[PDB]
Fold this protein.
Amino acid sequence: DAMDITVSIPPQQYFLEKIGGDLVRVSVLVPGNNDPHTYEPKPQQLAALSEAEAYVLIGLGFEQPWLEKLKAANANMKLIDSAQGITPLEMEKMVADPHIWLSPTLVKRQATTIAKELAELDPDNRDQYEANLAAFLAELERLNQELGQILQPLPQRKFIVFHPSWAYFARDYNLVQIPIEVEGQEPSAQELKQLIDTAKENNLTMVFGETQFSTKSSEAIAAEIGAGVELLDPLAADWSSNLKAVAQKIANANS
Ligand SMILES: [Zn+2]
């Protein structure tokens, strides 16, 4: 009975569960502990794709590397581009920043696009997808207000992270994300120092790393500038509670 849908990353399963509930059965391509930017789908996964009725793309080029392989594995599945209508930020002007799933504001748009496409695929349950969408959009506004309350009073708006997956989140809440990685690469020995000074000159209290990437340089920086080390997980499946934990971590660090 349920529609088989595959999504790219764990957070999307959260969005799909909220929008589809029991009407969909979700599979996920990228493991929560892998760097999605260098992930290559496994043969057993491409085979399983033949069962899929639809595939939900983050879009903005996020899936560019696997796109041809997904289409060849299943030519009948609908590709849902969840980034439709969204104006992206650029990562050094080469391309769009694809981390739109960490902005509650932009997720409202992704959710609307997804529900609209699912209702086209499964017209008989259109009313349920619409009601489920409405429930999820209201939850998103409430989450947005909650995150804004946690972050608006910070005098320190800057935070250092290893991998820059938080540019949209940061724009939403007026934070400044200072990344350690450069062009998907570990910092130079010089850059590391420069980054260390930057961090010293701003009195930063904590350095964040991400589970999917080595925290080696975040740890070295923290040891050198007198800070602690915390993990932020941009791929957490428990999306809403993870975002609140992220905001609290940032608030605790600038406090
Ligand atoms: Zn990323």
Remarks:
- The first strand starts at residue 3 and ends at 7.
- The chain has two domains: 1-152, 153-255.
- The two ends are 51 Å apart (CA to CA).
